[PDB]
Amino acid sequence: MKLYCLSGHPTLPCNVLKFKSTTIMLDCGLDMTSTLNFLPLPKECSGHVFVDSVPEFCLPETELIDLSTVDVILISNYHCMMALPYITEHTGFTGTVYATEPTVQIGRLLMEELVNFIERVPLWKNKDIQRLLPSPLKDAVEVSTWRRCYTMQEVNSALSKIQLVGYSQKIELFGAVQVTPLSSGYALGSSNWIIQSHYEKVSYVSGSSLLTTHPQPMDQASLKNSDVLVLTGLTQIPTANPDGMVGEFCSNLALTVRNGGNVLVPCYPSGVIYDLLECLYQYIDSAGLSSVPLYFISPVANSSLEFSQINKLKHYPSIHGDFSNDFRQPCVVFTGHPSLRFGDVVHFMELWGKSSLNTVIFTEPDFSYLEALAPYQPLAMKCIYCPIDTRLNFIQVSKLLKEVQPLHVVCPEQYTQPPPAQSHRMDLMIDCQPPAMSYRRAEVLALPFKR
Amino acid sequence: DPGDDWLVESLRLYQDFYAFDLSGATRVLEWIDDKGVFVAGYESLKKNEILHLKLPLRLSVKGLFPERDFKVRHGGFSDRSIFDLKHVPHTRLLVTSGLPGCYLQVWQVAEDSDVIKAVSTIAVHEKEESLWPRVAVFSTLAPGVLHGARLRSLQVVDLESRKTTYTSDVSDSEELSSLQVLDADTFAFCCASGRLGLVDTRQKWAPLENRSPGERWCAEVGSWGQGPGPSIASLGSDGRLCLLDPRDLCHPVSSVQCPVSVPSPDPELLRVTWAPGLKNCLAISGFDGTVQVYDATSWDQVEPLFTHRGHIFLDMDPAPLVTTHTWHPCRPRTLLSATNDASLHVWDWVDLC
Amino acid sequence: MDPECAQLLPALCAVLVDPRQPVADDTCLEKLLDWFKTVTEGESSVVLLQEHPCLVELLSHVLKVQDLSSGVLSFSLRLAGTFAAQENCFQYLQQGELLPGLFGEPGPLGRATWAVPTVRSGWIQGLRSLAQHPSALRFLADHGAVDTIFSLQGDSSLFVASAASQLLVHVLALSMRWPACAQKIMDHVEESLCSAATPKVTQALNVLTTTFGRCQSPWTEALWVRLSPRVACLLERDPIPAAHSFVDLLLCVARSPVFSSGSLWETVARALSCLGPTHMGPLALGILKLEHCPQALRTQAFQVLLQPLACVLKATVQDATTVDTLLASKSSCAGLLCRTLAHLEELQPLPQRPSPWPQASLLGATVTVLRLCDGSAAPASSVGGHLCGTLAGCVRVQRAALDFLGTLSQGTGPQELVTQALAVLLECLESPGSSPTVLKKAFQATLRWLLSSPDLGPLIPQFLRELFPVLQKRLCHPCWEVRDSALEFLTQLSRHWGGQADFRCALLASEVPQLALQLLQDPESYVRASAVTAMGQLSSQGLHAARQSLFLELLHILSVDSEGFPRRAVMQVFTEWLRDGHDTEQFVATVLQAASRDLDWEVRAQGLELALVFLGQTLPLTEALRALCHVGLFDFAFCALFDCDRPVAQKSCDLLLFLRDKIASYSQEPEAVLAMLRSLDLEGLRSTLAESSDHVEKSPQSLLQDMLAT
Amino acid sequence: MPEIRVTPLGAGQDVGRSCILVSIAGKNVMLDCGMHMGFNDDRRFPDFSYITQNGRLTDFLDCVIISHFHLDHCGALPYFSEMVGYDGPIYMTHPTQAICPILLEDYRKIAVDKKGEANFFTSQMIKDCMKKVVAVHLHQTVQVDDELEIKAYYAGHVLGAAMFQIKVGSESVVYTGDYNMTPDRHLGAAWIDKCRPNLLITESTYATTIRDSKRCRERDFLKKVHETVERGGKVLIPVFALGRAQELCILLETFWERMNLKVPIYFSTGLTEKANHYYKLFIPWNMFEFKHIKAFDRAFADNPGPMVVFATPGMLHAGQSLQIFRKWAGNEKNMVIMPGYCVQGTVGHKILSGQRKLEMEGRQVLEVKMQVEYMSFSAHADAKGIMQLVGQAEPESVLLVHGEAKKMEFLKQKIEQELRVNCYMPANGETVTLPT
Ligand SMILES: [Zn+2]
């Protein structure tokens, strides 16, 4: 019945549904965008106030509802679990957490990569000191509930408690409140959820897709009959078509390589990189471009590719080692943490960031490349933006809302109004009948459909 | 894969070879003429599509024809599993029978369409329907159905006026295993125990029979109007074949054992035929995925002059047996064999000797 | 006929009617009927039945065998038709009750063949084939056939229905030059025009459309005077009667000064006012394409044409049914805008277009719709925003607008327009989210806009240095369509602006040449061919990135390449270089040596053309022939002469003729080789080779031999 | 509210051509724009006058759909896309898009030989018609016009065929090209899940023929070739550029390896190595490169000794095979084998029925003594295949174009009395309408 919203970021939610007795949690998410404010891990960065300290991560709200009394914590995909250590350790939570197999495997990979990038590498958060600090340091929000980086022990202790669930299985609880996950074609093993009961069935979509069918496609059918449809994770960019942006990616890559420079690609070790590499292989075989080495450099590459299974791409654990032997020129180096706050990508940038034949190519729809790049200027390396977001646009949202049509719909604040930049494109909003309801951080919502 | 190896063997063995894959398993063959053949499924739980199929243009050349495959000439449906069929000379009328049904259907072939209509039924006093009767037509001035399941049921009735013209009226309760129209004055049969018999019609039932002193003996009489030459073949479920003479039927002529790989599991799928184009050449079939052909006069356990095994390689699974074989009345050495796994092959063999 | 088919005609007449033969072909029967027309169109027809009195036996069989095939009845019927077209024959074919039988109930009309469309079509075609002289009108009237045609002009076989309507029109146009036949026809027509169904009024309007506009006798004038009330009253049903043959009838009546003798234009105005926003466009354009019209009418026509673009330009920072349609859905808006832009595109290059003709407002509307489709518009009301929505990422509107804005390029005007157009075209060239067809259209439009401005001006070099990065990003798109488009655009540009300082500076400054040079090894053959032509062109100007080591590259593509397109493109480039006057002996030698063993029919032809160019450049004839023999033209010529293809032998015969002309006009010793070139009858040779490749297989004698062989 | 309409143009007992105009609720679609050889004027291409009686085709239609690459399903594409005018998408598959230009160029050569270019395309038009093509991947589902979603399948019978599905939400059509069900040793067989479409526009070319398995076909081909080789005397196989030539090459290679022969096998234009790419595509749909298959030339096509020869002017049209067979005619040992259906108006259709005394250029005359053989390697489905596929799709109706009109008198009755679902049979123009 009741609903607390312990985070506001659209792609990385945290939704606490509260029934009569059961209290389910959804998608414990980490907001790494705050990390964009600090310095790299090798002041007035181009005129912006940056807190040179250890990188930090914004934890969601916790004070709103006691985090021990929560009952169950589901998980939709790997992007929405990087904040699991804190929530399962620092407060005394005791319940269980369900997920899928590839979800937990890839979450393991990403957690290990992050703790490696924080461990291998060995003052302004006050109220008035920030409200007087230069922008966009003061532009931050809720600078009190932040937390430092977790440790590997917490990673393993959290992976201890996660229970694997196959596709479309069914689970019960104390009350007769069944729950069930259904694939949603987003990633290798995404899952929207259903929380059915005696008389108050609820659905919960989170970041689905209708493009390439090699994963298990979205089951838009099994979501009918719903009564209250919580919805999250639409596209992060308003207007683009992933095929166009993949064409742009390949075109810029081939333009830079054929010129005589090098190409840098920040990206997660697992995730978008599968789509990127499949389309780039298609290109290499399509436009005849070859005889270039694709070095992939991530300390978690081996398990990543072995799981992509269950000789062009050369995967390494780091740079110090076999790299200074095979490192030809040109090259296409997929590496780094995409936020450019920590990792070998800092070394690669500082090495290449002075010439004008090289090129960085952003592909992450989450991290805004402008501020993420600002601490490096002056930069003679031609930067580019090329988001690849295969999530639900608004047309497909309206179409699926028609094809299901539940009683109500609950959404974040940013979905009942056009984006703040484009207010004239008044199609980008949830035009569902009847009109939907909204919330924000720490908003106590209540849809009393008690009948 | 053994297939290509068997194909390179066939390159030397056969002359022509066509391997069609029918819709349903057939167990009945009879030419309307040398331009087409009749078939009919025998499955029990579903309908059965009697089909009339045009022979490939290549086989009956006397140019170089574009097509080399069966064409569907006429279709028809039924609900009973057909187990026998014939053709009346000069007519478009097929008398049939099958399980179940205590009545011989009579189908008329259409003219301006590709369908087949059931036009009449022949009613029988058949109380025991677990044994299906034999059927046959006559090549007479008046089309004479001759049929029956038991000797007392062997009767001659005409086509139209249902007038039962002749019957054995014997007392026996025996269910024979073979019947044959020989000529417009006499015919023959063989019991399910080996009791052959040459019977006449212009007089009362006059059984001239060789006595058999429960493996079923399927029989067939050879060429009529030739003179000498023992021309009665009959084979049992043990691989025991026997040839006897028409004019002195009491004394056996050539009783031997064909070197079959196994005594047939069901003697209901056993068959023997004669070569209507050559002399004393006889074919046997029904024990395994093969078919055998011998010559007789060179015996006075022998070797098989020709063995065909096509149904074992192209299609390992439970034994696919030849459910029926059939000669061709014009081409000297072509056979047509139908298998229980929805296949039908038409093949000639090299004149090795 | 001929002294050969006589020996075959009775055999054919016997094998056609036989029932047990194979069903005769269709190609053979149609070509047989074509030959029969070629025979019995130049001479009499009764002589052909007094000299070979066996075809009449077939025509008799048509109504005697009662079991022919649906597909030879048609042949014999159309044969009777094409024969019974002369008076003497039209009666020589009735002695025995044959023609009344052939088409009447004693024919296929009474059998169970009036269910297969081939027989209906043959019947109608035969009737139309005979009905030319008044005896045919007597037959068509008295015995009664016109009611059969009225029955067939409702059929479900568009071939049959259309042939029937054309037959009605031909019967009327024969008769009325009111007799009973034309009277009955027009009575039925004017009766049908009063029904409340679609097929009746549609067929009636089609008969009228084919009647008017086709024949211009004064009786058609009175016919229209009589029929105008019904047409003019059609425009009152709520579902207007099919609303398309209506527009076609109005627009076809209007194009005759004869019908200017004043109640039509009122109907045209009422139509422009009432017809729906799907046919109003075609009518408006067909009116505006007319020389003569009251100027108020053409004013309203141009107004109801421009309405949608004006409404679009209204509600974007820079009238009921149009705005309703635009806000209806995406399909309606896209169709309306596509149709309007296509209309305005066709209307322009005509000299009868309205004067004045807005060039600035139109250009602004096109640029605004193109920006709306892109996504960089600036709405100014709720309808503007919803339109920006319903046009976001459309493709048909973008194709249409690009083609339009490419057509508004020969209208000379101020530099502001050229700057606006090139700005929007460059913003459309560099956009992730541009399909390849949009990019091809935009390259064509940009080229046509660049080449139509008042040594390259004060504003171009900046645009060239803005363009070449985009043309560089396009030379690597993951779709060979766009690579080829950009390569041919570079070729067109560098051919029109080759000798200009600013263009060559801006080109050699950037990185286009080396990319084009690397594209000579792209997998897809079309991209390789286009890159080869582009490099040849860029080379003949002197814009490399010596040309010698380019030559070899191209030569290699000629020697060992899988496909054929690169080979003929290379040969074209070589012919170009040599005709240009741009070391020559070995050049021609190696090119003929690399072309004398190619398995195409185009490469050998281009090699012969190159030989012709070199010959022209040669002709002191002794040194000339010494060079022409060291290159080795004799081998190529005499080996391609007796070839297995027609075009190559033809071109070689042309070359040998040219050479013999010149060498005999000037006259080893050239005398012996001239005697050799005279030895073969190049005249009879070219006569044989200039033939069609079926001068032995199309011959109706071979057709008859074929049809009787089976 | 809506009705599904289907209008055949050209096709229907006129198997030569092919064109089917589907009309779903508000969307027109054209399937299988086809040619027709044999004729020599605008009668060959279909009658596009029952479409153009409106605005231009760019506004009427939504998307052409080309099943496969045979010149009877894509031959009139450059004429329909450039001359008549159509600026839109033409959804093919990948190998079809890669093969079509070659076939169209070969037929352009043929029709330029015969002086038959009144209304006939040129290489530039073929290029401008291939630039509009928008390839699809198997089981990939594309979204045309935001409301017409189409999706391919796998059928077989050629390297690149397909079975398209067109969906407009409530309705859908399933067009099946030349499909196949027997998993022969070349490509495979079809597949489709039970979409229960509103229609299924199949073909009925072989509806009443029981066809033999390809084993006996290949066996008889090998028998004739081997018997004519061992005896002394050459074989000649006239083949177009693509199509049969590659398959006969693979078969001869695999058999001459199994039996260790040495005689040379020739194929003139050796672009089969490029075939690598789309033979690569066979894993979606080095690995084998030939030991005996050399290249060709006019030089040693005349010296004695057993030999096989693949030439490429077509069905003994003008060109190479005509000259070769001209030189090889007067010899009882040689033979010719036509792996196709020779249409009227060529030497192949004069030899393949009767006549053996040809007529060369002028009053000349050619004799024929060599053996002649006709071997159909085409692989269409038949009665068993048609019925198995209809069962495998569970369609709410069935339509029969690209086939004759009398065989339906039993095919339709069988389908009805077997599935109690209605079946139709339009003629060459009869609109078949059905309500949703
Ligand atoms: Zn095909």
A209, A210, A213, best to mutate vs chain D, most D CBs in 10 Å: A213
CATH number for the domain formed by residue range(s) D214-374 = 3.40.50.10890
Breaks (C-N over 2.5 A) in chain D follow: 285
Q: Are C152 and C161 in contact (CB under 8 A)?
A: yes
Nearest CB to C338: which of D59, D130, D319?
D59
Contact status of C498 with chain A (Cβ, < 8 Å): no
Closest approach of A191 to chain C, Cα-based (Å) = 30
Contacts of D140 in chain A (CB under 8 A): 212-213
| CA B87, chain centre distance (Å) | 13
Measure the CA angle with vertex C281, ends C277 and C286; round to 5°: 150
* Whether C432 and A239 lie within 8 Å, measured CB to CB: no
Q: Distance between CA atoms of A425 and C386, rounded to whole angstroms?
A: 8
Q: Which token pair is C165? A: 């309507």
Q: Are A267 and A364 in contact (CB under 8 A)?
A: yes
Helical pair D123-130 and D94-113, crossing angle rounded to 10 deg: 160
The CA D68 to ligand 1 mean position distance, Å, reads 6
The 3-state DSSP class for residue A28 equals coil
Read out DSSP for A4-15? EE----SSS--E
DSSP state letter for A291: S
Q: With 0-12 CB in 10 A as exposed, 13-18 as middle and 19+ as buried, what is C357?
A: exposed
Contact status of D268 with chain C (Cβ, < 8 Å): yes
Q: Residue ranges of A for the binding site for 1D-myo-inositol hexakisphosphate?
A: 2, 19, 450-451
Residues 6+ apart with CB under 8 A from B134: B84, B147, B148, B149, B176, B178, B179, B189
The CA D335 to ligand 1 mean position distance, Å, reads 27
Contacts of C706 in chain D (CB under 8 A): 344, 349-350, 353, 355
Type of residue found at A104: V
Type of residue found at A354: K
Nearest by Cα to D65 from D196, D167, D166? D166
Q: Residue C356: is the preceding peptide bond cis (ω within 30°)?
A: yes
Read out DSSP for D188-238? ---B------S--EEEESSTTEEPBPHHHHHHHHHHHHHHHHHHS--EEEE
B1, B15, B71, best to mutate vs chain D, most D CBs in 10 Å: B71
Nearest CB to D59: which of C335, C688, C705?
C335
Q: How many CA atoms lie within 13 A of C186 on its CB side?
A: 19
DSSP state letter for C337: H
Neighbours of ion ligand 1 (CB under 5 A): D 70, 178
- D3-210+380-435: CATH topology is Metallo-beta-lactamase; Chain A (3.60.15)
Nearest by Cα to B181 from B159, B200, B202? B200
Closest approach of D319 to chain C, Cα-based (Å) = 5
The CA D178 to ligand 1 mean position distance, Å, reads 5
Q: List all residues of chain D from 18 to 37 with a beta carbon under 8 Å from chain C.
A: 26
Q: List all residues of chain D from 253 to 292 with a beta carbon under 8 Å from chain B.
A: 254-255, 258-259
H/E element holding B146?
strand B144-148
Residues 6+ apart with CB under 8 A from A54: A38, A148, A149
Q: Which token pair is A144? A: 């009190």
Q: With 0-12 CB in 10 A as exposed, 13-18 as middle and 19+ as buried, what is A334?
A: buried
The CA A315 to ligand 1 mean position distance, Å, reads 46
Q: List all residues of chain B from 108 to 127 with a beta carbon under 8 Å from chain D.
A: 113-115
Closest approach of D45 to chain C, Cα-based (Å) = 14
Q: Distance between CA atoms of C437 and C416, rounded to whole angstroms?
A: 28
Breaks (C-N over 2.5 A) in chain C follow: 177, 261, 318, 454, 545, 582, 619, 667
Measure the CA angle with vertex C447, ends C445 and C452; round to 5°: 100
* Whether D428 and C159 lie within 8 Å, measured CB to CB: yes
The 3-state DSSP class for residue D435 equals strand
DSSP state letter for B195: -
Burial C39-77 (b: 16+ CB within 10 A, else e): bbeeeebbebbeeeeebbebbeebbeeeebebbbbbbbb
Neighboring chains of A (3 or more beta-carbon pairs < 8 A): C, D
Contact status of D210 with chain B (Cβ, < 8 Å): yes
Q: Residue B100: is the preceding peptide bond cis (ω within 30°)?
A: yes
User: Is domain A242-385 in CATH 3.40.50.2300, yes or no?
Assistant: no
Q: Distance between CA atoms of B348 and B333, rounded to whole angstroms?
A: 5
Determine the straight-line distance between the first and last CA of chain C, rounded to whole angstroms. 23
Type of residue found at B198: L
A246, A248, A251, best to mutate vs chain C, most C CBs in 10 Å: A251
Contact status of D361 with chain C (Cβ, < 8 Å): yes
Type of residue found at A20: K
Helical pair C501-509 and C480-496, crossing angle rounded to 10 deg: 150
Residues 6+ apart with CB under 8 A from A120: none
- Cited resolution, angstroms: 3.9
The strands making up B334-339's β-sheet, listed across from edge to edge, are: B14-21, B343-349, B334-339, B322-327
Can D203 be counted among the known catalytic residues?
yes
Residue C78's alpha-carbon distances to A128, B233, C61, C125, C545, in angstroms, are: 102, 64, 15, 6, 69
Q: How many CA atoms lie within 13 A of A199 on its CB side?
A: 4
Q: Which token pair is B192? A: 């399910």
* Closest Cα in chain D to A211: D141
**Catalytic residue chosen out of the listed positions D203, D218, D247, D373:** D203
Contact status of C510 with chain A (Cβ, < 8 Å): no
Give the technique used to solve this structure: cryo-EM
Contact status of D406 with chain B (Cβ, < 8 Å): yes
The 3-state DSSP class for residue C620 equals coil
Q: Distance between CA atoms of D82 and D33, rounded to whole angstroms?
A: 14
Q: Are D27 and D62 in contact (CB under 8 A)?
A: yes
Q: Which token pair is A285? A: 């075989």
Domain ranges across chain D: 3-210+380-435, 214-374
